[model samples]
Target chain A: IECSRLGDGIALAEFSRARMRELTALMRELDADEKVRCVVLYGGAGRSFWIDDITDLYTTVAAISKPVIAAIDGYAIGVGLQISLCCDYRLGSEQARLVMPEFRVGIACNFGGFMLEAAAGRTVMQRMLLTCDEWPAERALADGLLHETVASPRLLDRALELARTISGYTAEAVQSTRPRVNAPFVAGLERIRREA
Target chain B: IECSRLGDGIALAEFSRARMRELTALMRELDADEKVRCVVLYGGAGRSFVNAWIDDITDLYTTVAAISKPVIAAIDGYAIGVGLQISLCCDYRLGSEQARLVMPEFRVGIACNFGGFMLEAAAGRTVMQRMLLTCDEWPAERALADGLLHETVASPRLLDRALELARTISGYTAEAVQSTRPRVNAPFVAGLERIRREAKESH
Candidate 1:
């Protein structure tokens, strides 16, 4: 949904609200397509040529009923750091960078409470958020959050290849079991809302 | 009521949810009293002292109705950390010679999102901007504008005497007087609310 057309190192501060809406609609349409087993994302954005805030795609990407893949071909900072965290699987090219530097500017670090709690457990998240530090892709991969980190240049093609494997499974079966296995938290949230 | 036996460092974090409720109940009871003139607090704490654990006492401190009590804080060392923030948590601040207040978590990269977020309400725009960004400590005099400390006394006993100046206010009928007390203030928490609503709609 990013206008990475700004190319690299482009801080697109004037990102339009209307354009974001349009992107949300497109992602929704993609989700509704029964044949589309997986959504694979690539490309870089922002002044530093990376995904700036992954939360920009929050409504669409998080809302999607199917699995999503993020192929890190470039730098991902702030929200970009979270996009990789949100996905079922992440495959990064060797050259990609990932960091969350919100605290360095003296701003609120976490976008939301739930997101911060889930991404980094209490103490480690405290160190990262409180320190405003960054971690590269290789470290993220070893953190058990990333699926794979490839050394080759065919990173986009590699992600698509990973998607093709998921495509072979029955969509209904995969979709039904996916939430059961990974989304028990959703039920807990629903329960809290009911209690509240 | 905080235990006066300990010290300022110990008292600052003394607020628990139950204590907050006790404070609220006291304020309500005082609101109904005709003989009681004004309320003044002093000294340290007993049992608990952890600001991050916003229990009942902290909440009551936040929600108490403003009386013309001329509430005051008399501090020696570190009057204005989380504990000092609690005194500012009141309507009036009477700091002692040694009181120097600070909110340290902000300097460590985490934003101030808890009840202490109200410190911004007591701060000037420029001062608040600086405090929110860096690790600098504001002295007792500079802290006055944010309504942080009404007056800084030379000694703890003198601070109590300074606060007693308001006890004579008991003669005046609060209802007959035209007074407008502002609501509880928590600017940092307000900022968090805004970002949260925005994030929900961002994607």
Candidate 2:
């Protein structure tokens, strides 16, 4: 877990969950800090491609008190893609490719399918989860899955710029509206879990 | 109700809706007939599509939605308020390049009717929210990109293109195609009455 303060009440976390304990603790600490208004989560070097068990990580990120922005680049597969879906806004590089290949490997996609349905509609969700298709950044933008797409080298910078802009607003207004805006996405996820 | 047989089990219904009970009964009758595979709802020759909001607007949309066969709305000109709501009930929409789509309920100090949820289902929440908030007019190109219109053609070819698309569907296995429509349209059908109720209350 490599974390740094990006100024303007924003913090960035590049996940390398070699030990899940440290990562979980860091998330909790940042979440509790009143000074931290936003979190920008990104994949660390050599960590952009992987199939990992990050269900708890996703849940924690969702529970985080502040808004989260995911800065995505390269391949975000399986848990990688699912974690980004947990964020409030997703910013991806032109090179960003997202897929949940678990179904192809004979594993269910778990909660990601519900999140995917909320981000994109039912058609896009069916195509990707059923076929294990690679969803490129351009398609993601068209489907409303990504808030914006930037050049590969500027992904983090773009995310930080957004975080700073969000921090500029009154914390009361931003915090009060986040849950209402996210209600539909969270409701869909809850429905899936209850039905399962 | 001047309905024309457009071949291949497809029917084209001109705007001409009146005598709410009679027209709805006619719709129910056509829908019950097994020969009618698809219905193409479009404007009549040399008329602005739906000039006025009629009391039968709700019945028209509900009837369109209730039909087991697919309904395709072919828009060739301005579709405003009730007109646009009727089109929203259709399974697919085909628009002419000159078509204009707008929901002006908010500007008139009334909430959108049956069309609100349908718009949300076709376009995403963000687009629907913006449209509702701004009460903006969207041309055919924007509507097509937003998924409100599945395809577009020149004004002269709008109905012909819609008929062609409907014929293609009519040629398929009826069981497979008809069954697939309900599942795809379940979101639009669900909570429609509730939304209408709430809209009325708000107004």
Candidate 3:
């Protein structure tokens, strides 16, 4: 992952793989950096790709103190989908495709899977997990997979705007509220890991 | 809460102050009733209620939430204090344009203990703090926008929409639907319980 400081205490962590140790460590580095108030995770690597770096890399987004907004365009399947779920806000482009094909690999998603079920309806997630079917941005947005559906071109632009806005808030207020909002996500991720 | 079976395995459990014990028992009774597949929990008689027999029922909302099948909240009027809190407990909430949402406990020299976790879980932190700290009442439009209400319709259509919602959920594969509830709620309930325990320890 390439980390770019966008100024005004907002940093954009765009998706890239390998050196998983360094990438996961980068999130912690950002969290400890008092100057960086918010971080936005971008999945626009080569138009429609994302990290399936599940182990430390994926859950790290949820671990950080700063708010993370996942900005997606194109495909968010498997690891791409998993990491995005770690973010506090998920905004996807019109062209985005969401899928969780883990069911095929005999990987029961446990609490992580339940997050999908809990967000939307049962059958919608059922079909996604069972059939590994793809969901368009609009359907995913309606079903709570994506927080907002944006015009394909403006995905990153809007995400940066959101991150910057969050960065401008009184850091104390933003920091205090983040853990409460993210407690369920972190707890579920820890459960999945503990059961492993 | 008097529960009336509304046909097709659907039941309506309108909220009434049922002497504390009865209200608590009725929730468990409805849970075990095989004939009732889905429930619509309503605030009765053009109501957005006031004071409860509050203490005995501290766990009541969680019990209502834990019911095996789905529960839908139909909010056609002001949903204040506990009224708003219980709506958060339901699986789905449908409100009328006439619906007003508030948690005036903070302003009344009381802290908003109930559904605090659920509030942040349902609506993100910013809006939840905005509502709680300001004690500002939100109309249906704001409530719907802020993720408080799943959807809002005309006042005449609120109950119909909620029942229709209950019908759709009740018609699905029963085991699949029932099994999903605990999984869906586990994390949120866990967060609630952990926080409560921590709060208790602090005291």
Candidate 4:
């Protein structure tokens, strides 16, 4: 329930509460909110969201009609990292740790694997999932995960500034185009999830 | 024609006369050549062709993209007009520090068919609009920033860098490389064919 209006038709949705259902509801609420034109989902405190919850989270965020930007300060592990791929713009801090560790739990991250390939191409997506290695922001920036890398202190400022600029632009263009561009991603996620 | 099969299973193609015909034939040969695992297409000398009459050379992109092996475009200088558009078909594109990438088709009143479509497909909507409308020259730095070119290095190292990557990718297990390559390029390859046919009917 920490979702709030940040003025300029932007919604600042943070997950400081660490509850996946509440987080998904907030995303759904913002997606349906008439006042919301842009959404900046920040990776907030702790990491407890597991696989099943993330399936709903990624689909919800990916399907959001508005232009979405994800801001991550640190520890975008497992579901944390995959959710950000659903965003239009991914802004990361200098010290951000991006990793996919769904294998440690004795399960392959099929959903994240499909999403990662679409975002960063197959080569990168394969290496990350196969190695299950953690990457620093610089590597993430090069591999297409983090669109822009900024210092930790300036991360939120940069994300909001971009969100404001995006919201300030043509709402119809940004809002309408996002779903079209992401339609394939949602479909692929579903295909893989269902086929398995 | 400076076409030679590298010892490490790479095809190095330098368009001999810089004509659309030469570009088309060379690509077709390499695409069918089983010995080749990867291709490095570079502007070895003179201009990169495919710049004239949009419909004439529109299918060249599809031919290059249809090749299952990975393709790398090495641009040394002035990848302008059709020269720049053709490079987008490759899997990886590298440009020299002094390279200039431009799309001036709109200025000539020749509406781009596949070029405009590939620009939007690879980059984005606004990017395609600006490049199509502005028709300005993008230096290597700006070209890389715009996602048109993947990496930029010194002119001396441009071909070498391309070779290095081509060799690296070529050495990977062929089965693994081939399996994933089609899916990666399937969207664009199929897309360009549709655009070509659509443009053909209009013409």
Q: How do all models score by TM-score?
A: 0.40, 0.55, 0.61, 0.60
Q: Write the per-residue lDDT of candidate 1 for residues B1-203, one digit (tens) a residue.
A: 54221221111112245555666666665555554445555554211114334334344454442443334455555653455555655555666656676765433433343322354345422233234323457676756634457776666364445445444443456544215342233443343344334324322
lDDT of 2 at B67: 66
In CAPRI terms, model 3 is classed as incorrect
Instruction: Estimate, for each residue in A1-196, the C-alpha lDDT of model 2 and write its tens digit.
Output: 6899977999888765654557657778987888888888888432483223254555566666577888888888876687777776787888888887888899877577777776677788888889998889899888877767888877778788778866665565455434444545555555555565
Once fitted onto the true fold, the runs of candidate 2 whose alpha carbons sit more than 4 angstroms away are A1-113, A122-139, A146-186, A189-196, B6-9, B16-23, B33-35, B45-58, B167-187, B196-203
In model 1, which regions exceed 4 Å deviation?
A1-16, A44-59, A180-196, B1-203
Clashing pairs in 2: none
**Relative to the unseen true structure, what is the C-alpha lDDT of residue B58 in candidate 1, on a scale of 0 to 100?**
43
Per-residue lDDT tens digits for candidate 3, residues A22-65, read 76788899998998988887767436552135556656777676
What would the per-residue lDDT of candidate 4 be over residues A1-22, giving only the tens digit for each residue?
A: 4787988888988763257678
Going through the candidates in order, their DockQ values are: 0.02, 0.06, 0.04, 0.04
With a 3 Å backbone cut-off (N, CA, C), the pairs that clash in candidate 3 are: A52-A79
lDDT of 2 at A101: 81
CA displacement after TM-score superposition, residue B47 of candidate 1 (Å): 58
**TM-score of candidate 4 chain A against the true chain A:** 0.90
Model 1 error, position A154 (Å): 3.0
> By DockQ, is 3 or 4 better?
3
Clashing pairs in 4: none
DockQ of 4: 0.04
Q: Against the true structure, what is model 1's DockQ?
A: 0.02
Candidate ranking (TM-score, best to worst): 3, 4, 2, 1
List, residue by residue over A44-116, the lDDT tens digit for candidate 1.
4222221222333553455566666667767767655554555556667766666666778665654422344
